[PDB]
Amino acid sequence: RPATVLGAMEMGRRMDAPTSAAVTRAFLERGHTEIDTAFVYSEGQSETILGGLGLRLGGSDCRVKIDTKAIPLFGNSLKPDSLRFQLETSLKRLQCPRVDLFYLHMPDHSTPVEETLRACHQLHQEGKFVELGLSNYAAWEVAEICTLCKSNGWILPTVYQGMYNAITRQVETELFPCLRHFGLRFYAFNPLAGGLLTGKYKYEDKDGKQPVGRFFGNTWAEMYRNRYWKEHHFEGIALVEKALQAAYGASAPSMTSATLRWMYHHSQLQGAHGDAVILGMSSLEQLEQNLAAAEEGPLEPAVVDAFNQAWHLVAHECPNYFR
Amino acid sequence: RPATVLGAMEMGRRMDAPTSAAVTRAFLERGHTEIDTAFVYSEGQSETILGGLGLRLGGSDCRVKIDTKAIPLFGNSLKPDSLRFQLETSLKRLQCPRVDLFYLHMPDHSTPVEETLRACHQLHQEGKFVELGLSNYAAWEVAEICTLCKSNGWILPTVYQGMYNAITRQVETELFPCLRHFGLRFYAFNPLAGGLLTGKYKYEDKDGKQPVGRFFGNTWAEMYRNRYWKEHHFEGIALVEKALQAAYGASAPSMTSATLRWMYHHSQLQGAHGDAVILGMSSLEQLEQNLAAAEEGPLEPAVVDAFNQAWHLVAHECPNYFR
Numbered sequence: 001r002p003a004t005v006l007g008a009m010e011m012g013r014r015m016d017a018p019t020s021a022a023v024t025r026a027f028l029e030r031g032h033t034e035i036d037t038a039f040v041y042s043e044g045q046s047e048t049i050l051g052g053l054g055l056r057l058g059g060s061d062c063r064v065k066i067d068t069k070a071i072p073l074f075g076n077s078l079k080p081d082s083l084r085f086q087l088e089t090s091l092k093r094l095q096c097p098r099v100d101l102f103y104l105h106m107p108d109h110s111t112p113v114e115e116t117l118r119a120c121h122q123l124h125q126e127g128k129f130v131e132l133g134l135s136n137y138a139a140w141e142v143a144e145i146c147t148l149c150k151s152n153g154w155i156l157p158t159v160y161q162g163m164y165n166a167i168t169r170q171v172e173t174e175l176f177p178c179l180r181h182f183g184l185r186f187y188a189f190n191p192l193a194g195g196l197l198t199g200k201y202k203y204e205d206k207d208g209k210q211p212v213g214r215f216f217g218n219t220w221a222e223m224y225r226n227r228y229w230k231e232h233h234f235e236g237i238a239l240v241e242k243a244l245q246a247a248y249g250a251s252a253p254s255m256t257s258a259t260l261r262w263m264y265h266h267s268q269l270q271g272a273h274g275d276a277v278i279l280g281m282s283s284l285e286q287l288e289q290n291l292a293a294a295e296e297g298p299l300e301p302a303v304v305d306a307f308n309q310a311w312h313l314v315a316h317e318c319p320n321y322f323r
Numbered sequence: 324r325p326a327t328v329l330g331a332m333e334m335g336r337r338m339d340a341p342t343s344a345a346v347t348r349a350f351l352e353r354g355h356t357e358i359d360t361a362f363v364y365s366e367g368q369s370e371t372i373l374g375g376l377g378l379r380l381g382g383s384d385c386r387v388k389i390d391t392k393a394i395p396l397f398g399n400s401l402k403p404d405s406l407r408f409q410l411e412t413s414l415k416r417l418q419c420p421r422v423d424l425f426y427l428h429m430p431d432h433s434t435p436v437e438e439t440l441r442a443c444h445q446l447h448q449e450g451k452f453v454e455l456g457l458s459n460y461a462a463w464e465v466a467e468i469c470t471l472c473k474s475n476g477w478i479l480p481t482v483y484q485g486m487y488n489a490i491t492r493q494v495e496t497e498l499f500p501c502l503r504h505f506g507l508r509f510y511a512f513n514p515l516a517g518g519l520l521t522g523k524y525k526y527e528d529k530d531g532k533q534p535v536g537r538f539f540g541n542t543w544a545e546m547y548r549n550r551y552w553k554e555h556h557f558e559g560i561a562l563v564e565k566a567l568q569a570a571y572g573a574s575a576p577s578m579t580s581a582t583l584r585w586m587y588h589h590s591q592l593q594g595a596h597g598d599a600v601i602l603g604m605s606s607l608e609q610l611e612q613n614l615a616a617a618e619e620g621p622l623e624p625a626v627v628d629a630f631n632q633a634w635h636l637v638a639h640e641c642p643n644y645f646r
C-alpha cells in the first residue's frame with residue numbers, strides 16, 4: 001500500500017546515462033511516478049541525466065514527479081543566496097521550470113533556520129517548487145520549523161525523508177509521532193541499509209575481499225561502514241536468514257526480498273498517509289529484483305519476530321537519523 | 324557539582340507527617356534548598372504535609388524553593404479552568420501565595436497546547452508562580468512550546484523534569500540537545516530506577532517473595548514493573564556489582580551509592596547549566612544513605628564502563644521518557 005519512489009543517487013556514478021534511462025523506463029512501466037535526486041548527487045551528473053530523458057519535467061502535460069535537495073556541505077549553505085544557486089542549477093540541469101518537491105537535505109547549524117525558510121517561501125512564491133521537504137533533521141527541529149511557518153505564514157514542509165530499515169528504527173520513537181502531528185509524510189531511504197540487508201556481504205570482508213560496492217572503494221565507503229558494518233548487524237542478518245529457512249524452507253525468498261517486504265508490510269510506514277519507500281540500486285538487474293519484492297505480499301509472523309529480534313540486537317549501536 | 328532536589332512523592336504515602344518533617348530537616352541541614360511535589364501525590368497529602376512544616380513557603384523571608392505540578396489524568400485536564408483549580412489548590416495546601424516552579428506534569432493530548440500556555444501566562448501574570456516547567460513531554464513537543472511562547476510573548480519553560488538513570492538514557496539522544504538549545508535545565512527523576520538500582524531485589528521475586536515496596540503492593544506497582552523489572556536489567560545490575568568488587572574489593576561501595584555517583588559525576592547532567600537530581604526515598608535511613616552518596620566523589624573508569632555496558636544491554640527495551 002505504501003508508495004515507491006526511485007532513488008536516483010547512483011545515476012551518473014555506478015550507472016551510466018543509458019543504464020539510468022533503462023532503469024527509469026522500467027520503474028515507470030510498473031506504474032510508479034516519483035523520482036528522488038539531489039543537487040550534490042554524482043557531482044550533478046544525476047540531475048543532468050534525468051533532465052535529458054525528455055520527460056518534460058515540471059510541465060502540466062507530465063505524469064512524472066521530481067524531487068531534489070539543497071545542502072549546507074562544501075562551499076554551500078542554506079543561507080538565502082546559496083539556497084537559490086542550488087535550486088536554480090537543479091532546474092537548469094533537469095530542464096524544467098519547477099520541481100515537485102524541494103528538500104533541505106540536512107541541517108545548516110551555522111544558519112538560523114528562520115533565514116532559510118523565508119528564502120524557501122520566496123522561492124515557492126516564484127513557483128520554483130510545489131512542496132517543501134526536510135531530511136535528516138531531528139524531530140524537534142521539525143517541530144520548530146513547522147511552528148515558525150504557521151506563525152509566519154510560510155509554506156510548511158509536508159514531506160520528511162529519513163533513514164529507515166528493518167535493522168534501523170530510531171525514527172520510530174520520536175520522529176514519527178511528530179510527523180503525524182504536523183501532517184508530514186515519511187519517505188524512507190537506506191531501505192536495504194546500503195545493500196547490507198541483501199545478505200551478500202560477510203563481516204570478515206573488511207579485512208580481505210573488500211568487494212567494490214557501496215561499502216568499498218568510494219569516497220563515502222568509510223562512512224557507510226561506520227553506519228552499518230558492525231558485528232552485531234551481521235548477527236542479525238544471520239538470525240533472519242535462519243528464520244527464513246525455518247518458516248519457508250526450500251521456497252524461501254531472498255532476504256533482499258524479505259527486507260523490502262518488511263518495509264512495505266510490517267513497518268510504521270502507512271500508505272494511508274502517503275508514506276513511501278525510496279528504492280536504491282546500482283544496476284538494472286537489481287531494480288527489477290527489488291520492484292518485484294515491492295509487489296510481493298506480507299511475511300510469516302515468525303520472520304517478522306526475527307527481524308524484531310535482530311533490531312533489538314543492534315538498537316544500542318544504531319546510527320542517528322539526524323545530522 | 325549538579326544540584327540536589329528533594330523528592331516529596333512518598334510523603335503522605337510511605338512516610339507519615341513526622342517522618343516527612345524529619346526528612347525535610349535532614350535535607351535542609353545538608354545545605355540543599357529545593358523540594359519537588361505535585362498536586363496528585365498521595366491524594367494531596369504530600370503538599371498538605373509540606374504546607375504545615377512552617378517553612379513560610381513562597382514568602383520573601385524563605386530559604387526553601389518549592390515545586391509543584393498539574394496533570395491531565397483523572398477528571399483533570401490542562402485546559403485553563405482545570406489548570407487553575409489544580410494550582411490554586413496546591414497553593415492553599417502549601418499555605419503559600421506562590422510556588423517557585425510550576426510544571427505541566429504530562430502532555431494533555433486532548434487539549435491544544437496553545438490554550439494551556441496562554442493560561443500558564445495568565446497565572447504567571449497573577450504571580451501564582453515564578454518559573455514554568457515541563458515533564459514527560461517529547462523533545463519535539465518542548466521545541467513547539469518554546470517557539471510558541473517566544474512568538475506569543477508568554478513565559479518560556481525553563482526547567483524540564485525527566486526520567487534519567489544509569490540504566491535509562493533515552494533522554495540523551497534528542498531531549499538534551501533540545502534543552503541546551505532552548506536553555507532549559509534538566510531535573511532527573513527515577514535516579515535509582517525506583518530502587519531497582521539499589522540492588523536489593525532479584526528478578527525471581529515477582530513469582531515469590533514480592534517485597535512490599537515501589538514494585539509490589541500498591542496502585543502503581545505494576546506500572547513500575549513494566550518499566551524496570553526486566554530480565555536484562557537484572558543482568559546489568561549483576562555486571563556492575565561484579566565490576567565494583569573487581570576494581571574496589573573489600574572497600575567496595577554499595578551500588579545505591581555507585582548509581583547515584585554515576586548521575587552526579589558521569590552523566591550528561593551539568594551543574595554549570597543548573598541541572599539537578601531529584602532524590603527518592605521511602606524512609607529516613609534511606610535519605611541519609613543517599614545524601615551521603617551525593618557528596619561522594621567520582622568512580623573508577625572500569626566501573627563507569629560497566630554501567631555503560633549494562634545500559635547497552637537494556638537500551639532496546641528502554642522505557643520512553645515521554646507520555
Ligand SMILES: NC(=O)C1=CN([C@@H]2O[C@H](COP(=O)(O)OP(=O)(O)OC[C@H]3O[C@@H](n4cnc5c(N)ncnc54)[C@H](OP(=O)(O)O)[C@@H]3O)[C@@H](O)[C@H]2O)C=CC1
Pocket residue numbers: 006007008009010014036037105135136161162163188189190191192193194195196198200212213214215256278279280281282285286287289290
Ligand atoms: N538525503 C538522504 O538522507 C539520503 C537519500 N537517499 C536517497 O534514497 C535512495 C535510497 O538510499 P540507498 O542507500 O540507495 O538505499 P538502499 O539501502 O536500498 O541501498 C541501495 C544499494 O543497495 C544495493 N542493492 C540495490 N539493489 C540490490 C539488489 N537487488 N540486490 C543486492 N543489493 C542491492 C546496492 O549496493 P551496491 O552498489 O553495494 O551493490 C545499492 O547501491 C537513494 O538512491 C537516494 O536517492 C540516499 C542516501 C541519503
Ligand SMILES: NC(=O)C1=CN([C@@H]2O[C@H](COP(=O)(O)OP(=O)(O)OC[C@H]3O[C@@H](n4cnc5c(N)ncnc54)[C@H](OP(=O)(O)O)[C@@H]3O)[C@@H](O)[C@H]2O)C=CC1
Pocket residue numbers: 329330331332333359360428458459484485511512513514515516517518519521523535536537538579601602603604605606608609610612613
Ligand atoms: N516528573 C515526573 O513525571 C516524576 C517525578 N517524580 C519525582 O522523582 C522523585 C524521585 O523519584 P523516585 O522514583 O522516588 O526515586 P528513585 O528512582 O531513586 O526511587 C526511590 C525509591 O527507591 C527505593 N530506595 C530509596 N533509597 C534507597 C536506598 N538507600 N536503598 C535501597 N532502596 C532505596 C525506595 O523504594 P521502596 O522503598 O519502595 O523500595 C524509594 O521510594 C520522586 O520522589 C518524585 O518527586 C517521580 C515520578 C515521575
Ligand SMILES: [Ca+2]
Pocket residue numbers: none
Ligand atoms: Ca556480542
